[PDB]
């Protein structure tokens, strides 16, 4: 049972101390670690530190965790990994940025989620809140074609019947001769945006001037634009839903423990097939029969499925859905399970865009009761988890037990004569409603 001489390398801004890193059972193999802490990195300090670490001990792995927001550290780490044959994991900060294409001979794996997984989570939110009419605004930032193709294929193979009205690409310089017409074409309520944080400000300012931001319109943006949460520009409306990574509950000690677990488990599983474990180079200067790629597609650790995909991403990441409340801070709403999504707000509240210069009155609260053939109440179909297309959602307060007054707002589906009348009135008078069945009693008596 040979051990692994893993080397853990972190940053000063984290409160982690070297003694805790050197102390931190249950791992299949023994792991003695070498820990050094360093501040902001540079393309020469990285290389000097890494070459020094490989001299004196046969380093067998590496766990690099940073704190800055520079997106060249990932590429430097990939280059070093492909030149020295050292399995490198990304943990936090700069290294966690997802690099799309890596060299075929590099063993660099990262913690994070790609644009496909972020798009899946956004579509899941839209389905769960019954927003089935939407548009799509993308600039010429790299990756927009992948984004659009994935969304189209996902929409074409669903049970819900998405009505994707438009696919807009603002390719000009916001000349207002074409971008203005393009943005006038949009009349839906849900808009997916894909651009860098610098272009997002301009587009949102233009949309606010045009009148596209209010109590009704909902904007959903990926983790690209809602980046560092300390810097919040003035053009972001309050209520901007975005998907990001879990920097709140995932402790750095948990991250480094999981890294050590993955490396030890992969080495242990590879020791059975071949009786030799992979090792680093003799030295950086001077002058790969089997690799670990096939041994990191299936790895299990404490019930948590830590398997990596065939491309270099996590199979089960930990995304988090965040919104920008009225206090100009990003507040966490719901998390991502192994497969499905949990939301804290069963009923989506209404957020005051900007200074809520125009208060809303078109949203009404409507109370009804079941008496066929005027109002009929049915349960929600579990096949699509959505009311069939000829009904409207409702909600009813059913108490779990009579001992306590706590209950749940069960969501059902309604239809009938009065409901057809109501939909016609909504289409004509142009208002929106919040239907719910009455709980206290029958029609009325004093």
């Amino acid at each position: 049972p040979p051990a692994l001489n893993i080397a853990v390398l972190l940053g000063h801004s984290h409160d982690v101390t070297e003694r805790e890193l050197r102390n931190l059972t249950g791992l299949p193999l023994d792991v003695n670690v070498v820990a050094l802490l360093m501040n902001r990195t540079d393309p020469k300090s990285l290389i000097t530190h890494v070459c020094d670490l490989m001299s004196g001990a046969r380093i067998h792995g590496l766990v690099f965790g940073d704190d800055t927001d520079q997106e060249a550290v990932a590429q430097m780490l990939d280059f070093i990994s492909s030149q020295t044959f050292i399995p490198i994991l990304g943990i936090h900060g700069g290294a966690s940025m997802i690099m799309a294409d890596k060299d075929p001979t590099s063993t660099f794996f990262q913690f994070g989620a790609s644009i496909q997984q972020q798009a899946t989570v956004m579509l899941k939110i839209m389905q769960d809140y019954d927003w089935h009419v939407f548009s799509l605004v993308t600039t010429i930032f790299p990756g927009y074609r992948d984004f659009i193709s994935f969304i189209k294929t996902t929409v074409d193979n669903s049970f819900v019947g998405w009505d994707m009205q438009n696919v807009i690409t603002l390719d000009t310089s916001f000349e207002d001769a074409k971008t203005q017409v393009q943005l006038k074409k949009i009349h839906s309520s849900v808009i997916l945006l894909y651009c860098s944080k610098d272009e997002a400000v301009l587009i949102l300012s233009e949309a606010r001037s045009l009148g596209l931001t209010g109590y009704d319109f909902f904007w959903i943006v990926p983790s690209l634009v809602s980046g560092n949460t300390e810097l919040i520009p003035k053009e972001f409306p309050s209520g901007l839903i975005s998907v990001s990574y879990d920097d709140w509950d995932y402790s750095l000690e948990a991250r480094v423990r999981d890294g050590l677990g993955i490396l030890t488990t992969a080495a242990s599983s590879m020791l059975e097939k071949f009786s030799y474990i992979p090792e680093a180079k003799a030295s950086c200067y001077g002058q790969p029969l089997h690799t670990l790629h096939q041994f990191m597609v299936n790895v299990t650790w404490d019930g948590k499925d830590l398997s990596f995909t065939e491309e270099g991403y996590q199979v089960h990441p930990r995304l988090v859905v965040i919104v920008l409340n009225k206090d100009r801070e990003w507040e966490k709403v719901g998390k991502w399970e192994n497969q499905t999504l949990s939301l804290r707000h069963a009923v989506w509240p209404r957020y005051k865009s900007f200074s809520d210069c125009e208060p809303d009155d078109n949203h009404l609260s409507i109370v009804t009761l079941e008496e066929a053939p005027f109002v009929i109440v049915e349960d929600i179909d579990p096949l699509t988890e959505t009311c069939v297309r000829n009904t409207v959602p409702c909600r009813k307060f059913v108490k779990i037990n009579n001992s306590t007054n706590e209950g749940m707002n069960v969501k059902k589906c309604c239809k009938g004569f009065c409901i057809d009348i109501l939909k016609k009135l909504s289409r004509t008078v142009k208002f929106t409603y919040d239907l719910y069945l009455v709980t206290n009693g029958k029609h009325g008596k004093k």
Partner: antibody
Amino acid sequence: QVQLQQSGAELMKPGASVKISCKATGYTFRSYWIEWLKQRPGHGLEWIGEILPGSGRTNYNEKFKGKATITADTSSNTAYMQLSSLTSEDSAVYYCTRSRGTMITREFTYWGQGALVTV
Amino acid sequence: DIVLTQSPASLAVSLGQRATISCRASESVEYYGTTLMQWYQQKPGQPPKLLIYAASNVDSGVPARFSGSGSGTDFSLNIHPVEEDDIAMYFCQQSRKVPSTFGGGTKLE
């Protein structure tokens, strides 16, 4: 238990070539490095080279580059040292040592009996 | 590389009190919190035996009379009480820089 065994003493006319065999009989042979050492008559030690039996990777010291060759066979559990162009200064004892994969240093633990060559 | 040097080359000490040996390295051999230095004892006609690793930790299966300490570029080894075991030579090996190197040796009587 880990035990290592070598060949007997060697004595040839100057200019010949000799082989030294080291046999491992206590562990998984395809998992640990095998280092070679040279000992002159009681005035120091040096380092020749190492071989990983599993993958076959080899490292050498600069002074002994191009003079000695290390080859190992995964079937007979043998490590072969290939000396070339012996001279008057090659009369020394040769050891094969193997560490244990449990510490952060690179130390020498299990030692061979050693073979003495004379020219 | 690193070049070691042991002083004195030959030492003669009476049995019972103590014996001290130093091995000063040319460059610092500290590797991120653990100094790399080992001591050997070799009886004539036999392979050497490992005594101290990491310059401060004793090897299992050896009498407690053997000890070592030091830091940076200077290290020392002291034994007490002097007995019939300290008759062979001693060596210091560094492992900071490849290739590994050995000392000059020192006998006792």
